[PDB]
Amino acid sequence: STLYEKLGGTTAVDLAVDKFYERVLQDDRIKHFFADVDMAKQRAHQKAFLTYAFGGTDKYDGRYMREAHKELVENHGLNGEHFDAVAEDLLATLKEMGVPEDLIAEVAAVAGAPAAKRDVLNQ
Numbered sequence: 001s002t003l004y005e006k007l008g009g010t011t012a013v014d015l016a017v018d019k020f021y022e023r024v025l026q027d028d029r030i031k032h033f034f035a036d037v038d039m040a041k042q043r044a045h046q047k048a049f050l051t052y053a054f055g056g057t058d059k060y061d062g063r064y065m066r067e068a069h070k071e072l073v074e075n076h077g078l079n080g081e082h083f084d085a086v087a088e089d090l091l092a093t094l095k096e097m098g099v100p101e102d103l104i105a106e107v108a109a110v111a112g113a114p115a116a117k118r119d120v121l122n123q
């Protein structure tokens with residue numbers, strides 16, 4: 001069920017999260033959304049998105065998603081391109097840690113799932 005289990009333990013999860021966080025930090029398309037976010041929240045956010053994309057959506061009610069990103073949408077110009085960039089960053093991270101291509105496509109399908117995307121984007 002858990003992220004822990006699907007990736008195979010604490011060290012695997014830590015690797016995924018740290019590499020994903022590193023990549024987002026360096027991605028000029030989306031870095032400025034985290035401008036007013038301390039680095040603890042920044043890393044927690046990537047662990048959240050990662051948790052979501054591996055099928056732990058349970059914690060990410062669309063109504064919570066809609067409120068949590070409202071200021072990004074209204075004041076930072078958050079849009080589809082940004083949303084897609086975060087998913088692409090995740091799939092690039094997993095590939096570089098040798099996650100099977102069929103498993104990457106599985107997480108691609110959850111990461112880019114339409115109803116959660118509409119909620120985050122306040123559409």
Ligand code: HEM
Nearest residue numbers: 030033034037041045048049052060068082083086116120
């Ligand atoms: C389904 C996709 C995503 C999920 C599941 C997700 C989840 C979360 C969660 C749980 C929070 C709330 C944290 C809290 O209450 O303190 C949050 C906050 C935030 N998310 Fe997302 N998010 C998603 C997509 C995005 C995208 C596309 C961006 C930026 C390009 C983004 C940027 C942020 C920002 C800046 C915050 C506020 C700061 C923070 O708490 O890190 N999120 N996100």
